[PDB]
């Protein structure tokens, strides 16, 4: 059960900090941004303390980790040539960083937002951006994230993902990241028919491309397109369904990353749920009082 969470690189520990945090949640994998998620803005490869972080991951059994590219990257942009160009450039640097970790195979990327050009146009730009980024001999894939359909996001259906993959010439370097919150919010019934939804994914996109799993419950109903994550089992997806995904027989080798919200109503401040959530999902039974246990620790 390859399972972990979003963690942080603090600097100057950087990578060592990510790995300690993950270890402290009892995590077997984890996910990092290379930098702040909301900007671009990055320390050189030399300052990521990779040797030390890799040493601590060996010692505590972590073999693979995930990278998520910052979410301001929009290679779907058609009106500001420099935003498109900025995304190509950064992805090129990001592949270099990630490569420079030894042991991240994947960079999660929000495909893009068409921001008024409509999906077709946005998707053609993403193909174009990707075709400018990718090399046939790069050693890390880009994992296109399943999007919730919020605002003008492209990647909101499997058909949109597949369309992007078919567009790019080095598509062997493309994977996908299946986020449970997003797919639910985008209207797929992963609650009483995840097996069906997986089959569809396999037909449209192909299950071998499903290389990252984001395990989030959701604050909103199916189809809401709101991308508001919730703690495991306390949302609209619920424990049975999330548990089923986590332990799915076809997904044993794929790393599961919780991106669930920290806990602490409402003037504090503000505790990570990952340790307890992970163990609850291992235990196979819903802990009605998990939120109150998360608050003390
Ligand atoms: Zn994401
Ligand atoms: Zn996600
Ligand atoms: Zn989300």
UniProtKB/Swiss-Prot annotation:
Keyword Lipoprotein: no
Ligand binding (Zn(2+) 1): 68, 110, 145
Keywords noted in UniProt: DNA damage, DNA repair, Endonuclease, Hydrolase, Metal-binding, Nuclease, Zinc
Positions with a binding annotation for Zn(2+) 2: 145, 179, 214, 259
Molecular function (Gene Ontology), one example: DNA binding
Annotated Pfam families: AP_endonuc_2
Zinc in keyword set: yes
Catalysed transformations (reactions): Endonucleolytic cleavage to 5'-phosphooligonucleotide end-products
EC category name: hydrolase
Cofactor binding, per record: Binds 3 Zn(2+) ions.
UniProt: Zn(2+) 3 binding residues: 182, 227, 229
Top-rank taxon: Bacteria
Gene Ontology biological process terms, A to Z: base-excision repair
Cofactor: Zn(2+)
EC numbers on record: 3.1.21.2
Residue ranges of coiled coil: none
InterPro entries linked to this entry: AP_endonuc_2, AP_endonuc_F2_Zn_BS, Xyl_isomerase-like_sf, Xyl_isomerase-like_TIM-brl
PROSITE patterns referenced in this protein's UniProt entry, alphabetically: AP_NUCLEASE_F2_1 (PS00729), AP_NUCLEASE_F2_2 (PS00730), AP_NUCLEASE_F2_3 (PS00731), AP_NUCLEASE_F2_4 (PS51432)
Function: Endonuclease IV plays a role in DNA repair. It cleaves phosphodiester bonds at apurinic or apyrimidinic (AP) sites, generating a 3'-hydroxyl group and a 5'-terminal sugar phosphate.
PANTHER family: APURINIC-APYRIMIDINIC ENDONUCLEASE (PTHR21445:SF0), ENDONUCLEASE IV ENDODEOXYRIBONUCLEASE IV (PTHR21445)
Family: Belongs to the AP endonuclease 2 family.
Protein name: Probable endonuclease 4
Organism encoding this protein: Bacillus anthracis
